[PDB]
Amino acid sequence: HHHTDPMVSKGEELFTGVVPILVELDGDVNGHKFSVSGEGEGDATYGKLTLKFICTTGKLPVPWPTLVTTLVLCFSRYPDHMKQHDFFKSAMPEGYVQERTIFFKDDGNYKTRAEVKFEGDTLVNRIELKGIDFKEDGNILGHKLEYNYNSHNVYIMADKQKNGIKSNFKIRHNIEDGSVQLADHYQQNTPIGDGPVLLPDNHYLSTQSKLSKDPNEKRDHMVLLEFVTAAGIT
């Protein structure tokens, strides 16, 4: 609402209230083609997301928790003293590309590319996902993961050469038998536009996610509440 840096003001202004979100994913995992649509709202003031996702092609062929990181970090809450480090909002409204490779230990990998940008007043995240080399009897295609999600801190670093950011981090998915399925993420983000962006000092994001079901919904779906806060600069 009041920042002495006009570049920060420009990005904050687009995220000042509740912003509607649309998520589209087209996926192919070991030749099972599927699509997911999601709708909800983001409130960057509190770092809060609320989304509901539907598999529009029938039953989702992989477990919903494996898609949480893939299915909008511009809604992170950056403390006032860290707002000059917020790459994600500084790239708006033209947006950014978010690319990942996700390696599931002892199993296959996801390769994702997403464009995150405004269409009018709506923040859209449009994703293509390709998954290969998964085991039919593994934890992913065998749906052995529990329907829950662990809190996680992720380290963000600038990539000055690409005018973007980079991160590598591990997600632990609980398996029904009490064990864990590791998912190693590599991520890079680059701006879509050619204007300047804020390139951050090293810092981390703290995330927490809660998964639930809509008791009146017959389609395969996931309801997601996420909180993300930046930290690590004193």
From Swiss-Prot:
Contains a chromophore consisting of modified amino acid residues. Maturation of the chromophore requires nothing other than molecular oxygen. Changing N202I: In mut2.1; shifts fluorescence lifetime from 3.03 to 2.50 ns. Changing V197A: In mut1.5; shifts fluorescence lifetime from 3.03 to 2.72 ns. Photocytes. Changing I175L: In R10-3; matures to the red-emitting state with excitation and emission maxima at 555 and 585 nm, respectively. Changing S151P: Increases fluorescence at warmer temperatures such as 37 degrees Celsius. Monomer. This is Green fluorescent protein.
